[PDB]
Design a protein around this ligand. Structure first.
Ligand code: HEM
Length: 151
């Protein structure tokens, strides 16, 4: 589990993200889609986007980026007790959207990359290690639910 100090580093940089949820959402999803094209194929809403410029110009993508980061924010703020927040997410992503745990690892990488780009001062090695731990916890718990339903 993460220590109180680790959660503090995670939430300190996350407070910086909340100042521009939409901007962060775009960078993260675009990074995910470009680095791992197979993830884009999972979104019927975004499959038509063929260039980074098109992705950046999509208000629909920006809207989803907010949805994603808002859900993640609520999870991170629950620190070591995010059971209630994960249930609906793990459920939909396993059976409805069919998102393998590996894709959650990909988006975690994208999140960490964008955080470093936008908040280097509050995202040094210690904060980076803490965020990695928080995102690993997120994936681990979702994975447990995935195994439960046989996905
Ligand atoms: C930080 C990790 C993620 C979070 C917090 C997150 C959160 C959400 C939320 C809140 C929704 C809308 C409600 C729902 O259906 O549950 C959603 C929908 C969806 N997510 Fe995620 N998601 C994450 C990662 C991913 C990844 C990695 C993929 C695909 C590779 C993905 C694919 C989808 C799809 C396809 C939908 C349905 C979109 C639609 O039809 O409008 N998500 N996600």
């Amino acid at each position: 589990v993460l220590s109180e100090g680790e959660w503090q580093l995670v939430l300190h940089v996350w407070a910086k993200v909340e100042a521009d949820v939409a901007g962060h959402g775009q960078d993260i999803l675009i990074r995910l889609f470009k680095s791992h094209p197979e993830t884009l194929e999972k979104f019927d809403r975004f499959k038509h986007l063929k260039t980074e410029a098109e992705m950046k110009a999509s208000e629909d993508l920006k809207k989803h980026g907010v949805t994603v980061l808002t859900a993640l924010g609520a999870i991170l703020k629950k620190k070591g007790h995010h059971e209630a927040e994960l249930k609906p997410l793990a459920q939909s992503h396993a059976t409805k959207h069919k998102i393998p745990i590996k894709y959650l690892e990909f988006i975690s990488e994208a999140i960490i990359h964008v955080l470093h780009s936008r908040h280097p001062g509050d995202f040094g090695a210690d904060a980076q290690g803490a965020m990695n731990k928080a995102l690993e916890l997120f994936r681990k718990d979702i994975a447990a639910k995935y195994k439960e339903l046989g996905y």
